[PDB]
Amino acid sequence: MTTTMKISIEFLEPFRMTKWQESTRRNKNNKEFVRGQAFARWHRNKKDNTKGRPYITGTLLRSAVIRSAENLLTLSDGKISEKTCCPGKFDTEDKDRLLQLRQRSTLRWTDKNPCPDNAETYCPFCELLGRRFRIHFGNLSLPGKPDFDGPKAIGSQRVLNRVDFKSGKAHDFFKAYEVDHTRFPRFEGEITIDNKVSAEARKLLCDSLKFTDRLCGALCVIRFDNLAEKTAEQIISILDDNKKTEYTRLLADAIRSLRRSSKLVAGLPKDHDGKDDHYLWDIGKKKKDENSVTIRQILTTSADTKELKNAGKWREFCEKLGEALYLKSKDMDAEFHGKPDRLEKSRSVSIGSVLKETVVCGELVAKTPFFFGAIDEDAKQTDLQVLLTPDNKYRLPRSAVRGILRRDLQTYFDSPCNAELGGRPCMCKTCRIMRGITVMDARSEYNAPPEIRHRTRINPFTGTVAEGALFNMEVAPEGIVFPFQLRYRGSEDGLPDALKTVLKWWAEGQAFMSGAASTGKGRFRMENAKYETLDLSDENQRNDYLKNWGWRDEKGLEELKKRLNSGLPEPGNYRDPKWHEINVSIEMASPFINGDPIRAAVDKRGTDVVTFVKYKAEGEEAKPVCAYKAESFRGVIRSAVARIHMEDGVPLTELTHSDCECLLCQIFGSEYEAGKIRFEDLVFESDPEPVTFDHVAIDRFTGGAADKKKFDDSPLPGSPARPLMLKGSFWIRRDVLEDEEYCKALGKALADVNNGLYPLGGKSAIGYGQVKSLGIKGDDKRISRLMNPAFDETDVAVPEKPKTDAEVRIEAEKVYYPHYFVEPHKKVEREEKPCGHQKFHEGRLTGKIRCKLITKTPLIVPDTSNDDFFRPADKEARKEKDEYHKSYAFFRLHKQIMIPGSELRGMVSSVYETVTNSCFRIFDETKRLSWRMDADHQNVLQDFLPGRVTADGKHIQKFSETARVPFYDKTQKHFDILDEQEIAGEKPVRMWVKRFIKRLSLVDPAKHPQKKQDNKWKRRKEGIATFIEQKNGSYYFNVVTNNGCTSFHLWHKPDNFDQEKLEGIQNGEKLDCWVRDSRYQKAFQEIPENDPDGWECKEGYLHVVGPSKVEFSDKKGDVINNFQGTLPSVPNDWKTIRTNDFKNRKRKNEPVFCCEDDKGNYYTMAKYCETFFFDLKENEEYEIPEKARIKYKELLRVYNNNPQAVPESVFQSRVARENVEKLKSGDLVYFKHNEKYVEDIVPVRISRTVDDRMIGKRMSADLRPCHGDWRHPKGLCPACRLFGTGSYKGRVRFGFASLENDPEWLIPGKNPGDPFHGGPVMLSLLERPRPTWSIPGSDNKFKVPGRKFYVHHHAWKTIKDGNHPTTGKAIEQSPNNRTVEALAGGNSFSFEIAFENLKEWELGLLIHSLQLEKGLAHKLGMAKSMGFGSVEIDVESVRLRKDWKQWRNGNSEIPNWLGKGFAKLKEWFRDELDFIENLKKLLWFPEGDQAPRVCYPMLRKKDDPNGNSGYEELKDGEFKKEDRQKKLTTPWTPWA
RNA sequence: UUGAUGUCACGGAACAGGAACUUGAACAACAUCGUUAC
RNA sequence: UAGUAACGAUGUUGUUCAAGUUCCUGUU
């Protein structure tokens, strides 16, 4: 007796979902079951397990149908078809149930009796209301009834908000689930109607089902009828198998960046030679073990797997791989909800019968990168994320649009709302308009990943970043189009005036929707607006509206968009939007950098930092453009304001801004109110291609490149020819331009920015940034009227340089050395506190110094961007893999000769820090030294005893003595009778050892005429002689010693005098003879066939090392000559090398072995013997500490990395040939010990000795790098206060020097008429320095000398011709020297030095270090160990700064500064200023007719035509061991 | 998997504050091998 | 029982980033 009607709803927007709770907190007393009643619910079967499906109750649809029926019944004056309708009853006497009452002011029509219950025929509204069921409403569920695994598998919980209006920051908040509508767009159910309900109630029900449009926070229309985890584990295991475990976070941040495209893995950078050993992209490979994959190979084979071919799959793989790597690198409260008021009776009111409808279509594009915070969980790498769609599309929610309409409607009026989330609806002017507004979501169809930005926070006391202030941020691209649709229904004749004014504001590009609006985030603009007003008051238009469900669906919208008239309606009352745009145009004069290291790690150029580049969208694809961040510009202007204004004593950079109305707190805002000025990004107006500059860090002692300290950067190029314009804008509020107190502050700050201070960008300490001018427009001269400069234009001249007094006595026919260290003092002061990079102090100076550099000796500053600049034309370009002859040019920026700022910074820093006797800025406190020990028995080789380590690596057992066993000879055979188990020393052998051999001579007492002078004939006694056999040269004898106790057989070689005693031998005569003993320490295997004497059989260990001591050469040495032809070839394996020739041929002395390889090398090999350790003394061992093992490790590392070694791997020793690492267990060593503790372990007889301490502990404790903690503390060296350090910014900025006259090169070029290119000159070898010649020994006597200042001379006239400086031979090219292009003497440059917050004695010392006396000169450039690079600097106008208006050129104050600097220098050191005298002696320039000839020695004396006693004779006599330091300190000592 | 005579949740902007920055001459002379003889 | 004496040859590149901070303050 029923009739089922099947309905089905279909969503057009993401609906919302509530949270599940058990059936105990489901009363009217819970505050989360209420406020969760207007959403969809989540049912789970088998309670306590999150598994179920969503559903919508029937009571909610009943309430929506009731509300639509009330809204529809007053539109036809209460008559459905024929009969009038009763007003209905909404009163209930019981209120313990009915968990929620109605607070709505029910509509009215035809007020009459409420049709009491004791009736028999009701009003159709009472049949719809339900007065066994009359109209039963059923549950709506999913079509197929599936089962998901929880509420997080269909949706995502996001946080909503509730912001304030005056202090526009926040209030409480809440959160809810939202499910996307592209995955779950359909729900189904039915409605059970009785038979005898009516024939007019069904029409009302159908019209009410068609008139309802939203159910759960969304529009609707109701109708009726495993790789990434294992790859992460593999990469982590690779990083842990090696020692590169500190590159894990950079690897994570660089791998997450590859999610943009898969064509970036085949374009990762390489090394500088084009190899495949990058420092992070090639971790894992070794010298051996080819089956070792790297990270580049892992990313390459994972780029083509037929699973990661799509973009979404590759993006997801990159994201979760980066997340896993970040998580692996890691481990090394206020919310309101509800409270609705339970009102007893609703105040029923009438609204009338006039109802219209307005549709506004169009679209709104983005003009700046927008931001919508959707920071979710389970993703902790970015910590500031954006809102995305489940298919990675950008969207703007309707909550943000609704809140922004609310804010603009409150701003159009001048009265905020005062609602408190409860009770009767609010009835102000801005809540009667907001109750008829309906908007929609967007999708933007872009589908591209967002870029990541890095931000920091700077401590304004030191200048560096604060502790713990570093975070990321991701922003959406610029230029995305969102579809827009607004709909309003009310009683007016169209739109109101407030909405028309707000839409006219939005049509001018002033719709600041959401984001970090203070730093120039999303600003949209509504375009292509259409509108059309319907009329639901009549009946011929309402039925056509109800026939097609309005026009909400896609077909209805495509039919509606053909009826809308174009152009928005003009408002009746305009309001002049409250934001004003001001343009900004900056022009620079130097390079510019805005760091980005991750892009440098992914980029294929192979640099360390690259400039910042943002993307922009063109509809489906993104293109990059270089720009300047908005946060950096905002920070610059904020710091420029904060350092001038006082506000009651303490400046604005020291306040806490807790509850203060400071001047920064009222313009730039704080954590309690929003700001009133919004900046924006700055584009560069052109296409500047980045260039590459190389840098290095020159050590102080042994001035050369320090270890691990070579780097580069890729900034944008700018020069006084092409000035790198910058364009942008920023927005200010309307009620700030009208104030006269804030505009003055902004004008003062921009006037300080314009006058040269506050450089923009990165490394401004070497001449980057340097704003030349700044000009704003668009403000009617309210701010740009205080930005006018004002100088003095005086005529005071600059005082001339004083005359020098330190002179040297240089004579002819003598040579000099070029090093001459400068020994320092012993008192470096660190008892002063640094100033602080805050407000400009009162008694300190700030300004500019303009200098003038003029060269007087050829200068070389190379342009290391390319080699082969002097390459011949019209030939082959270059072979792939070879070592050619490098040749460079001079430095150019835009085809203009320049000198960088870091060169001058380093030079002046060295001179300034050696004047004030300050801390060694950069130093190498590692790398302990080592020396080869000499070959003399008494001094060194006496203490090294033979030994052997025990079964465990803890003790060394010593031996008694040694004897040498002959190998590689022709008089025995020891290789084919001993196996490999006994020649490696792991098994004892048994040899026969002889100690003393016996010579023979016939006449002892009557031998004084000929012999008996050698004094060795003092142990002869007597002896009888026999004869048993005849030989060719020798004769047999059987001699007794004193009484016939023993007899020995020997072979005696007679001589002239012996010949006569020989003459007759009948085998039986008794000759007279004498026996003498001589030393013979040999040990053979069996027995030799020449001495059948008593050999003492002993027991010991044997060990071999291989054929060492090769005198290889290239010029047919004295032993290869006078040979017997046909030299053999090199054998491919040892144990077969024999003796070829003898060194002495009269006697049978030392044997050699001459061979010849495929090249022109000629080897001559000594060492025809090996050593045998016998007589192992037990029960006496010595322990090995850790210092011995560290010394042994350094010894092995030196042995294995040697470029001067023998090219053949057969003639090396065992230590270097087999490449071993640690001390094994059971190997022979030569150790040194004293009282149970060993000191040194060497492998061979004559090896090298490593010193115990490092080189950092051979100085004083005060001269070490003045770095560390010992606001900032007071422990800083006097040179780390002018120039910076880590955790303290320096207050001196240098600048790019530029040439102004004509070049005037050294040698003319190849093309006449083009005076802008020079000719090439070829240099000498230029080999790296040796610190093992200044520190000769290692005990305690040799400390570290000074700072290695090179002397001035003229030795470039010999290189100009083509000879060598030491000899006179012509130099020949090779793949080890360069061919540079140089300038000549008589060129002029000009640069500028900016300083701030200096004292009056630091400026005097800086001027004394810039300009020297009138007889000295500086030295910069390349190859200044010859005569190359000699400059002098003259100082021009020194214009100071005293206020933000006037600058007061102070040329007339220099001598007071110089006197104060000298007075401070006298105060520190009383009368011990000898280091300044030495430094003035070392900077002396030969004024005239003096030609000091300096050069380095040669190796020996026989290889230079002058014969000047090279290094191998200078180690004895002059520079022996104790005069080295002394003779290298005196500024001009004769080279001898 | 809801209750019926009463749901303005299209009744609520994840908003407000923060300088990828600090320090650094692209430079530079004496070492490397071990034993041989009595 | 036991150790004493210092000699012979002339050739060759190296570093290519390092030390720091890598997240906080708050809504009623």
Side-chain angles (χ1 to χ4, degrees), chain A residues 760-795:
Chain A
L760 316 173
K763 324 184 59 51
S764 54
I766 54 177
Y768 291 179
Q770 284 203 331
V771 166
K772 191 183 192 292
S773 88
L774 189 141
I776 72 169
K777 51 207 297 201
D779 66 316
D780 204 358
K781 270 93 174 172
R782 294 201 195 92
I783 312 174
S784 88
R785 68 167 179 87
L786 282 181
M787 290 206 314
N788 277 326
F791 210 67
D792 266 10
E793 312 92 20
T794 321
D795 261 345

Side-chain angles (χ1 to χ4, degrees), chain A residues 1101-1122:
Chain A
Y1101 287 84
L1102 188 133
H1103 84 135
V1104 302
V1105 282
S1108 315
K1109 210 200 167 190
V1110 293
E1111 304 156 14
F1112 87 108
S1113 174
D1114 212 335
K1115 252 84 161 174
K1116 294 283 282 291
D1118 196 11
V1119 169
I1120 300 286
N1121 268 10
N1122 78 94

Side-chain angles (χ1 to χ4, degrees), chain A residues 224-463:
Chain A
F224 54 90
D225 43 347
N226 48 64
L227 186 40
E229 48 255 60
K230 48 152 170 162
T231 312
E233 182 56 41
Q234 195 176 6
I235 281 180
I236 285 156
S237 45
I238 282 179
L239 290 177
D240 215 329
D241 202 78
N242 303 143
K243 278 324 191 284
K244 309 291 160 39
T245 196
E246 72 260 9
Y247 294 145
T248 164
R249 208 205 154 106
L250 172 60
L251 255 174
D253 261 348
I255 278 168
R256 204 209 170 83
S257 176
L258 297 174
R259 77 190 166 160
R260 189 172 98 244
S261 157
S262 88
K263 309 301 186 142
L264 262 61
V265 174
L268 286 187
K270 285 181 180 81
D271 206 358
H272 303 88
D273 315 329
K275 313 214 81 183
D276 266 23
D277 64 344
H278 206 265
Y279 79 107
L280 90 160
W281 293 124
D282 280 306
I283 311 174
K285 70 172 209 172
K286 293 168 302 308
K287 326 202 302 313
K288 66 181 282 274
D289 215 359
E290 178 41 36
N291 50 307
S292 300
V293 286
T294 58
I295 311 181
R296 197 193 303 241
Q297 283 171 338
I298 283 177
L299 291 180
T300 308
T301 77
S302 278
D304 42 326
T305 43
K306 207 65 53 162
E307 320 186 359
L308 314 180
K309 281 301 173 325
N310 326 320
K313 297 285 160 158
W314 173 251
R315 186 191 159 153
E316 214 272 351
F317 164 68
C318 276
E319 276 171 359
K320 56 175 50 192
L321 179 53
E323 185 78 33
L325 269 166
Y326 164 77
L327 261 300
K328 180 65 211 66
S329 85
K330 181 55 67 183
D331 308 278
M332 221 185 298
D333 214 17
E335 77 167 84
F336 217 170
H337 262 284
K339 200 38 80 178
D341 263 347
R342 288 185 92 91
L343 276 64
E344 292 295 73
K345 175 83 181 292
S346 40
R347 269 88 60 88
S348 88
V349 301
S350 161
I351 73 162
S353 173
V354 195
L355 193 84
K356 299 190 165 36
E357 184 96 21
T358 298
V359 183
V360 177
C361 274
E363 72 202 342
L364 79 174
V365 312
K367 302 290 190 200
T368 332
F370 55 92
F371 185 81
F372 289 104
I375 171 165
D376 80 315
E377 292 320 323
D378 66 78
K380 290 158 173 43
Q381 211 189 351
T382 318
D383 72 52
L384 260 171
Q385 301 144 60
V386 283
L387 180 67
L388 294 174
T389 294
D391 46 88
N392 303 324
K393 274 188 208 327
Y394 296 98
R395 73 182 271 244
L396 51 86
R398 60 101 177 155
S399 40
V401 184
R402 201 168 168 90
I404 289 310
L405 256 170
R406 173 78 66 88
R407 188 197 65 176
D408 286 356
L409 278 194
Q410 269 160 310
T411 286
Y412 173 76
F413 303 122
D414 273 337
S415 45
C417 203
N418 282 161
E420 54 270 39
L421 302 183
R424 192 69 59 171
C426 169
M427 302 290 297
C428 48
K429 306 165 77 69
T430 169
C431 294
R432 285 198 273 231
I433 300 179
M434 211 39 78
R435 225 182 272 131
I437 287 296
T438 288
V439 294
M440 284 188 67
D441 279 348
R443 284 296 207 273
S444 93
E445 47 80 26
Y446 186 41
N447 191 327
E451 54 174 354
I452 318 289
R453 295 184 172 202
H454 304 271
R455 303 180 62 186
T456 76
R457 187 200 185 104
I458 278 180
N459 186 14
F461 275 114
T462 61

